Homo-oligomer: A and B are copies of this chain.
Amino acid sequence: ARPTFHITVGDPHKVGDLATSHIVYSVRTKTTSKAYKQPEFEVKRRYRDFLWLYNTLHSNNPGVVVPPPPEKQAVGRFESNFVESRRAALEKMLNKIAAHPTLQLDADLKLFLESESFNIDVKHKERKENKFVEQDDWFHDRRVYLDALENQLKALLKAMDNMVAQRKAMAEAAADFSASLHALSTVELSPTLSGPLDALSELQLAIRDVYERQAQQDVLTFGIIIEEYIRLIGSVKQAFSQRQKAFHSWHSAESELMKKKAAQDKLLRQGKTQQDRLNQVNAEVIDAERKVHQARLLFEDMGRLLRSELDRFEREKVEDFKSGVETFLESAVEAQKELIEKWETFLMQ
């Protein structure tokens, strides 16, 4: 039910130009999930609703994840692709969250997916309105690697940008190389020389297209999967900050404990202590003692949750780049076949 939540994000009611206009998607939840009311609902959410929503998920789940959002226009234009990315980004975000029972439980989200009126009015409606060193170590080890990996992923991202730019001329080149060959084939009046010139016009126009097409096959596949990760790596950094907070609050609980115990010792070494204050300070001590224990306890299990997540995440990353590598493979082989056919055409001339 929780992962068995079925989501189509479709219907790109892409509100026409404003230079910032916001696509509204059907969100059809067909859901056998019993974390979603409707076995089908469609809502028609707009970008803004989701981003917020995404944030809401962020908000209701205290460290408890919130993967990347609907796609950013922070590099996006409003492109079908971009909006698709958004659509996808959601799909993904949603997908996962649904196969995480908790994020899927956000009530706003139930209402959101299962009612069209946007996140907002839903959101009113809902609130009725080892060593200490060894533990620090894994956290720091972790931070640091994925910090390094992040700077790499930022360099790899901009590598992709280059690769798309470096498909251009190339393109402009083979587009004017075709015209060059073509041009003289219309002005030369010798059929059997004009014709071959013409055949070579064909090869270059054909190469231009095939090259340009492959940027959308293989390079864009990698540029999407790299973009996905930087958000998600981004997100466990937000999670990490919740855990350090969890750490901050514990340590405050502990400092509070020591203050109250130190006061008790002082009352004690006056040598006559009223029994009133001995019970009151001690009681508060005991409440502090729980606060410390509970605080340690949740914080411990946040790191444990982070471990379980880290090994999943790590395996995931490999699978994507293999499918990534598969998209490259299909384009490369297709390119060479297409080229044999180009070759054949000018044998027959």
Residue of B nearest to A275 (CB): B128
Q: Are A275 and B133 in contact (CB under 8 A)?
A: no
Q: Are A200 and B128 in contact (CB under 8 A)?
A: no
Interface centre among A126, A128, A268 (most CB of B within 10 A): A128
Known: A144-B265, A148-B269. A292 touches B129 (CB 8 A): no
Q: Are A147 and B274 in contact (CB under 8 A)?
A: no
Interface size in chain A (residues, C-beta < 8 A): 39
A345 at the interface (CB under 8 A from B): no
Q: Which one of B131, B133, B276 contacts A127 once the chains associate, using CB atoms below 8 Å? A: B276
* Across-interface contacts of A274 in B (CB, < 8 A): 124-125, 128-129
A224 at the interface (CB under 8 A from B): no
Residue of B nearest to A180 (CB): B226
* Across-interface contacts of A318 in B (CB, < 8 A): 193
Binds B, one of A18-26, A76-84, A97-105, A277-285: A277-285
- Residues in chain A within 8 A of chain B (CB atoms): 124-129, 131, 133, 136, 140, 144, 147-148, 151-152, 193, 200, 207, 250, 254, 258, 261-262, 265, 268-269, 274-280, 292, 296, 318, 321, 325, 332
